[PDB]
Symmetry: C4
Subunit: 282 residues, 4 copies
């Protein structure tokens, strides 16, 4: 079983555990549940105002006396500010509730808009991760590599990548634990990420995987977490993306196929159909 | 008396000291006070428009002449744009005030929405702090430790922790002062914080608490401030959380109980009922 | 003449130089000019719709034929969605313009709200700068110092300070220029800034002002720029503040008076009436 | 052919490749296409409600039976909340659809406002790049230089610049590739960028262009990418700007003309008409 899923999420059951986190819940529920909650409060509030009008008496013009239906639809036309003009308030109290209901309708619109903006304005990075890593010689050193691709034409500014090894380790007190190792990279910051980025960890005598083999990486249940962050121009907003690799997904001796090609016209070109293609000696 | 409270706030009386900071005050007052302020301005503005209409004359259809009540409710139905159709403006001046009032109503809605969004969209980190710290051997060194837990299923990106010692010190000029010491950590940046994080300060010969005891930490009135920051996925927004520990709350020789367990099914599992459990030799 | 003003702004005349920067201009003009611009477009757009209705003919119920006044106020009641019900559209064209005008009114509300939110949500740091700097011995080294104070009860997270020397220098090619020197600080990052912060630059043999005197600092026209940045809890938003000091404003041998006092009750207390008080030997 | 355009964008044809990225597309399409899309959905939704009302029967007051036109305009006056009062719902079903349509109108306004705010609030840095670079002696070292200018009076806080060399290189395994070199700068962070900034890369024995000539830079197809980032005070928001230079655009032996002048009055002054002027020995 893999501790980390391919999407970079955790695979641990949270056994540890309706308005204790209401703001978080309103932003994280599905859209149909969200729209349903908004609708319920919308209807519930009008029903409450309908009861308020009736409690005052027959204070709605052209309304059947004691009718909740008529009072409710008058509440709707008031809170929403439709104000057709057939059902209208009679007397100071009805007109005072109307003054209140209008305020309530504006406040509710502001709240609903605030929540919708927070849910909408959560963009995706649009970044593709290579399905595998490779370990192969680069500049005379065995180098762990993966690569990323921008799926959009807009560029990503101040793009950072973090490659973390997660493996079970034993302390000199005999304590066995999962340790996280930030892997030194040749380039961790790309000021402008536009097309493709080959992320590289030279396995030098300081690397946590120096001397390791495919087999020793399994025995430590070694996994590799990748985090990408950057400022996306399409959104003028920060974005991120995560991914995880198991030891099984390292191609020892592999080489990523070049995704940059030259056309017959001589134009430089990016072919992302080879993004997952790895070359290997047989 | 503790200079810092458990929540990381200061315990100093600010003896040093209604529109001098109005924007800050509108975002920091309680919600009932905020709603009351919005309501007051709402009613006050309509009253001002009611006086404006009356000052022009009897320019409201179906309104009792000289009646503020009728003019006020006509202002309400105009600013809120209900426009039932019984009370309507008569003449160019009343219609000009209506044109103005509608603008005022839109501007006021935009302002109210701006303030509501700023007050709403202030999420909490959802991070739990261990009730105590511990000092115990890790990797052959006495190590000060505390730990954090994510109370939500959504992950926190680029999570930083800062462990600061605050203690009374004396300069070589004889000046006694409170100094803040950033404590070097084994891991200060966790690219993805999902479940639990054990924060560690190896007390090596460079540590400000190297050689200190429980007693010497009291005599210096030593306290420990913790700051957590990160980008929460649930909100696509930055969050933070703070906490403070006294010397009394360091368990010398303690060991945090492991919150990660394996179920009979073999699934890895997180039990946060042991988050505050510390093991100690007796 | 001082190149930098006390507020950290530049004192250089920009001799180098209406819709070339319209978005910037809408956020930077004063509020009365902004409200005036919004009003003008509001009235101008209704006038344009009034002409559109008249161009179709007498298509407004209860409107005097050919009257711009009546058509204009009907546009107002339509765009603002008041819809009293006396002036109403006649025929498909008038009703089509109404369908368009309503859309225009919603789009204009969204635009106006977007601009208002951007102008409103620009908080101030609430940070006070000491009126002077001091140079005095701290930990056995002459140390340039200034200090900051939080004027609010809410804390500022991840607070950074940058102390820059600006002075006229000569290159070994003989070129005279203004150079900026980032001055090393004992603490440049305070994870939680709550009350007061004494910023310190030890003048060691690496300091750009090592060996300088009050007189040599004048001859180089030396100035000191201060930048403060942090995440304010009151706003859950980043804030900043700037300030500048001339050489005249350095008190050689000065010592800032302690703003932390103990009350008769024994409570620790912050007295900001001594924030600008400096002690000097005579 | 230049791999990077002067604006810092990539010049590679993306051969690699309507609701697969709908949120990105709504923010990136032109404004006329955006307004057209909003209009279409606006009209389409009203048409759907018109059909709903007719499907119930003749439930609209003063409406011609079976007329889509009349039902459609009644939908408009309901969703937009105009509510003139001539066309009004008859019976519980029509009034229930009205209750729904009003909600739909509010939700659609919130969505439209959210998208408009995201598209509007994407400010430009207002930063000018010198049309050329220069290599000339500074402080006794040949130094690559370009410079930036603030086109606005508002200052930019925590301004960063990154100067990257891009050139074709060969690995010791014989692999030819484009490598990116972060060029060390004398100043990469200017805490307050107000007027002009001369960015400098001393070509010391560690520089990737140490020993290179104008000719060798061509043979490697060397290009220089510039990224500027900062917090603009006019917007209280982060901004950025990018630019690219070819080897052809380096003036060997050049010196940027000083843009700072003193007036007859003695006031320091900034003349940006000389921003692109370079002095060269002939
Ligand atoms: K309305
Ligand atoms: K409304
Ligand atoms: K309104
Ligand atoms: K209305
Ligand atoms: K009406
Ligand atoms: K409206
Ligand atoms: K809004
Ligand atoms: K908004
Ligand atoms: K916003
Ligand atoms: K925002
Ligand atoms: K009517
Ligand atoms: K509406």
């Amino acid at each position: 079983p893999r501790i980390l899923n391919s999407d970079g999420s955790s695979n641990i059951t949270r056994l540890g555990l309706w308005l204790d986190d209401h703001y978080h819940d309103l932003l994280t529920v599905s859209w149909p549940v969200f729209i349903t909650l908004i609708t319920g409060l919308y209807l519930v509030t009008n029903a409450l105002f309908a009861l308020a009008y009736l409690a005052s008496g027959d204070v709605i013009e052209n309304a059947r006396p004691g009718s909740f239906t008529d009072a409710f639809f008058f509440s709707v036309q008031t809170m929403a500010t439709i104000g057709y003009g057939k059902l209208i308030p009679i007397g100071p109290l009805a007109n005072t509730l109307v003054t209140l209901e209008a305020l309530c309708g504006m406040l509710g619109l502001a709240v609903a808009a605030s929540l919708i903006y927070a849910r909408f304005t959560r963009p995706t990075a649009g970044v593709l991760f290579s399905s595998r890593m490779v370990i192969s010689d680069f500049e005379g050193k065995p180098t762990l590599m993966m690569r990323l691709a921008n799926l959009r034409i807009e560029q990503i500014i101040e793009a950072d990548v973090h490659l973390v090894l997660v493996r079970s380790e034993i302390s000199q007190e005999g304590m066995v634990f999962r340790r996280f190792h930030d892997l030194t990279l040749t380039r961790s910051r790309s000021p402008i990420f536009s097309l493709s980025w080959t992320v590289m960890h030279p396995i030098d005598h300081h690397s946590p995987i120096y001397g390791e083999t495919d087999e020793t990486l399994r025995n430590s249940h070694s996994e590799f977490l990748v985090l990408f962050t950057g400022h996306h121009e399409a959104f003028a907003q920060n974005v991120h993306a995560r991914h995880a690799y198991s030891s099984d997904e390292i191609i020892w001796g592999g080489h990523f196929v070049d995704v940059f090609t030259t056309l017959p016209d001589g134009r430089r070109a990016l072919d992302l159909g080879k993004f997952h293609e790895i070359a290997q000696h047989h």
